Design a protein around this ligand. Structure first.
Ligand SMILES: *CCC(=O)N1Cc2nc(-c3cc(-c4cccc5ocnc45)c(F)cc3F)n(-c3ccncn3)c2C1
Length: 300
């Protein structure tokens, strides 16, 4: 655990200025950090966890925050800072574009196959990194994947489930609260389904109490109209009862990277020719402005 990877922040160094959105664990705010002895206002993203915390949990919360601060990958948001008072405040780099769930919703039937398949590759790369570090996310979902730029996505909220998303969870996690790299593969399947349906709610109308019975019967999420049978098959392999039969993240990186080379062969999108392949000019602008970090080349 590198203590230098986590900055302990005092309430006097930062201020929340705008609510960006709320969820089951906390509220996301646009904040401003005013460094000690400076005059600058640096935009930051703060998430405040809504459970009443005590200083007894502090050592354990801090041990978890040290792990979240250690994750170093282009496709995973690492925790930068934390503030422990009566509430828990998690500080990271502000990402204006928000989450990939809201992004695919707001760009419904306006996203090219090239983006969708590359996002699938990037999400699998970040998950594979977490698996290599022997870490289980426990809460992979399109709301937990953030947009850095339209060409660069990063998985967020790693570690805060540990310190429930029934419809994203593998059968063994619903039944026995067992969370492994292979139950993360199941959630990856559902996350992919959320992208391919432009933010559709999985099992809409179905009460969360009925999900495990529906899964036992063999019922799964319906094939999105834009996926060929090969994209659907990879998703269905993610939702198998036997965890060991599900694909590995390393195999998912390879499969979606092969698919990204022939985008029109794997996804059927209306107006996919018109859907702008990121021009070198726009990529340079996006990168110099808000994405200077190192990142693996996007599959063309
Ligand atoms: C569709 C939902 C949505 O728009 N967003 C959900 C969300 N959460 C965060 C976010 C996450 C974290 C966080 C928590 C745990 C580990 C982790 O490692 C680094 N950051 C992590 C925060 F600390 C703050 C936070 F706001 N955001 C968000 C929005 C903008 N910029 C950054 N994060 C969103 C968006």
């Amino acid at each position: 655990p590198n203590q230098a990877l986590l900055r302990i922040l005092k309430e006097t160094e930062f201020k929340k200025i705008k609510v960006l959105g709320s969820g089951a664990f906390g509220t996301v705010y646009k904040g401003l950090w005013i460094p000690e002895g400076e005059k600058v206002k640096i935009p930051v993203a703060i998430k405040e966890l809504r459970e009443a915390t005590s200083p007894k949990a502090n050592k354990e919360i801090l041990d978890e925050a040290y792990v979240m601060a250690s994750v170093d990958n282009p496709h995973v948001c690492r925790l930068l800072g934390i503030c422990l008072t009566s509430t828990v405040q998690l500080i990271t780099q502000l990402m204006p574009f928000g989450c990939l769930l809201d992004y695919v919703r707001e760009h419904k039937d306006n996203i090219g196959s090239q983006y969708l398949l590359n996002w699938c590759v990037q999400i699998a790369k970040g998950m594979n990194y977490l698996e290599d570090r022997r870490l289980v996310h426990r809460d992979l979902a399109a709301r937990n994947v953030l947009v850095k730029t339209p060409q660069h996505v990063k998985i967020t909220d790693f570690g805060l489930a540990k310190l429930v998303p029934i419809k994203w969870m593998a059968l063994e996690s619903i039944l026995h609260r067992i969370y492994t790299h292979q139950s993360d593969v199941w959630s990856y399947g559902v996350t992919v389904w959320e992208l391919m349906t432009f933010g559709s709610k999985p099992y809409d109308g179905i009460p969360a109490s009925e999900i495990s019975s529906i899964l036992e019967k063999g019922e799964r999420l319906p094939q999105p109209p834009i996926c060929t049978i090969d994209v659907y098959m990879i998703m269905r392999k993610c939702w198998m009862i036997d965890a060991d039969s599900r694909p590995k993240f390393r195999e998912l990186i390879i499969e979606f990277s092969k698919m990204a080379r022939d985008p029109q062969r794997y996804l059927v999108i209306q107006g996919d020719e018109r859907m702008h392949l990121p021009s070198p000019t726009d990529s340079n602008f996006y990168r110099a402005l808000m994405d200077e970090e190192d990142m693996d080349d996007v599959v063309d």
